[PDB]
Design a binder for this molecule. Structure first.
Ligand code: Y03
Ligand code: Y03
Ligand code: CL
Ligand code: CL
Ligand code: CL
Ligand code: CL
Ligand code: MG
Ligand code: MG
Ligand code: MG
Ligand code: MG
Ligand code: MG
Ligand code: MG
Lengths: 228, 228
C-alpha cells in the first residue's frame, strides 16, 4: 500500500509517526521504504528497528499477560485470544524476516549494516522462539543462534569492542542464551567478556561515543546482576 | 467480523484484551457485543466506554502532536499524515456514534443507561469537534451540546448529585464548555455547582460510594484549579 509514496516521504512520515507514538504506522512507513529496493542509511536502519521493536514489544507484552492467564486457567476463549495475539505477533516477525531476506541482508556489505541486519534476524527468530513449542521450535532456535553467531563473527573481526551495534548484539545474544537456549552460563560468560572488553577500549572514545557505549554496558551489567 | 462469536465470549475477550492493554481489540469485541442487539449491563457499558476512550485517546494524542508540528511548519507530508490520523479518529467517533444511534440510546429506558449513552454521544461529538473547522463545525458542536444537555436534564431529575455517572457527565460537559464552546464562565459555574451539590450529599453514602464520588469530585476540583 505504500507503493505510490516517495521514499523520502515514507522516511519523513516514519519520523512523524515516531513523534506521535504511532508505531504500527511507523513500521508500515519503514516497510514501504525498504520495499523501494534501495539500501538503508544508518539513521533509516535505526527507524526500521525502533518501529518494529515497539510493535512486537506490545504484542509480546500482551501475549505474556494472556499466556499467564491461560496457564492459571489450566471455555476456549483464553486460548483462542492468546492464539489470535500469537498469530499476529508471528505475522509481524515473518514480515521483518521477509524484509531482511528480501533483500536487505544480501545487499549489506559494510560491517555496520550487515551486523545490524543479522542481529535483527536473530532478534525476530528469538521472538518466534518465545511462542513456539516442541521441535518446530528447535529449528527456530537454531535460526536465531545462526544469525546471532554470524553477526558476532563479523562484529569481532570488523568493529571495536565499544561499538554500540556490537554491544547491543552481544547483549541480545546473551539474552537469547539465558531465556531461550537454557544456557545461563553462556549468557553470563558472554555478557561479562563483552563488558570487560568494552571497558578496556573506553579510553579511545570521545565524550559522546563514551556516553553511547557506557549506556549499553550498563544494560549488560543490569543483566549480570539479575543473573548472578 | 464478530457475527459468529457468542455474546458472552465477546465480553470475556473484551475483559482479556483490557488486561493485555489491547484496546483496539477490546473495542472490536465490545462493538461485536453491542451488535448482538441486546441491551448492555452496567459492567458491559463500562467495558464499551473504556475500550473506545483508550482507542480515541491514542488518536487524539497523536493528532495533537501532528497538528502542533503542522502549525509550526506553517512539503505536504505533515498535513497528509495529520489528515490520515484525523480521518481514522473520525472513523472511530462515527463508529461509536453509530452504535449509540443503532440502537443503544433508543432502547435505554433507565436513567443510569440513558444518561451514560447520551454522555458518550456528547463525548464523541466533542472529539469530532476538536478536529473540525468552520461551520460544519458548528453543527458538530451543537450535537455535542444537545446530547450533554439531554443527559444533564435526566441526571438532575433521576439521580442523586453524588452519582458517579452524573458527576462524570458534568465534568465532561464543563470541559466541553471550556475547550470547545469558548464558554469558560459556564465551565467554571457548572464545575463549581456540581462539586458543591455533591459535597452536600456525601453524608448519605457508604464508604465505598463515598470513595467513588470523591474521586470524580477531585477531577472537578483539579479543573477549577486549572481554570481559575
Ligand atoms: O523487558 C524486556 C527486556 O528484554 C531485553 C533485555 C535486554 C536486551 C534485549 C531484550 P528484548 O529484545 O527481549 O526485548 N523486553 C521486553 C520488551 C517489551 Cl516492549 C515487551 C516485552 Cl514482553 C519484553
Ligand atoms: O488529557 C485529557 C483531559 O481530558 C479530560 C479531562 C476531564 C474530563 C474529560 C476529559 P477528555 O474526555 O477530553 O479526555 N484528555 C486526553 C486524554 C487522552 Cl488519552 C488523550 C488526549 Cl489528547 C487528551
Ligand atoms: Cl479471539
Ligand atoms: Cl554485498
Ligand atoms: Cl499519510
Ligand atoms: Cl426505551
Ligand atoms: Mg521516487
Ligand atoms: Mg499458534
Ligand atoms: Mg551494498
Ligand atoms: Mg448466542
Ligand atoms: Mg480532514
Ligand atoms: Mg430498555
Amino acid at each position: 500500500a505504500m507503493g505510490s509514496m516517495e521514499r523520502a516521504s515514507l522516511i519523513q512520515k516514519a519520523k512523524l509517526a515516531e513523534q506521535a507514538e504511532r508505531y504500527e504506522d511507523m513500521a508500515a512507513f519503514m516497510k514501504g521504504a525498504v520495499e523501494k529496493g534501495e539500501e538503508l542509511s544508518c539513521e533509516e536502519r535505526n527507524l526500521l528497528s525502533v518501529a518494529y521493536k515497539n510493535v512486537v514489544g506490545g504484542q509480546r507484552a500482551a501475549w505474556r499477560v494472556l499466556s499467564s492467564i491461560e496457564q492459571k486457567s489450566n471455555g476456549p476463549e483464553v486460548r483462542e485470544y492468546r492464539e489470535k495475539v500469537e498469530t499476529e505477533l508471528q505475522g509481524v516477525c515473518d514480515t521483518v524476516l521477509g524484509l531482511l531476506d528480501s533483500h536487505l541482508i544480501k545487499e549489506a556489505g559494510d560491517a555496520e549494516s550487515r551486523v545490524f541486519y543479522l542481529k535483527m534476524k536473530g532478534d525476530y527468530y528469538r521472538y518466534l522462539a518465545e511462542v513456539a513449542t516442541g521441535d518446530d521450535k528447535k529449528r527456530i532456535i537454531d535460526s536465531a543462534r545462526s544469525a546471532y553467531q554470524e553477526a558476532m563473527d563479523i562484529s569481532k573481526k570488523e568493529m571495536p569492542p565499544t561499538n554500540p551495534i556490537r554491544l547491543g548484539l552481544a547483549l541480545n545474544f546473551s539474552v537469547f542464551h539465558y531465556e531461550i537456549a537454557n544456557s545461563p552460563e553462556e549468557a553470563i560468560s558472554l555478557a561479562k567478556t563483552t563488558f570487560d572488553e568494552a571497558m578496556a577500549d573506553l579510553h579511545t572514545l570521545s565524550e559522546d561515543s563514551y556516553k553511547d557505549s557506557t549506556l549499553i554496558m550498563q544494560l549488560l551489567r543490569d543483566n549480570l546482576t539479575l543473573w548472578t
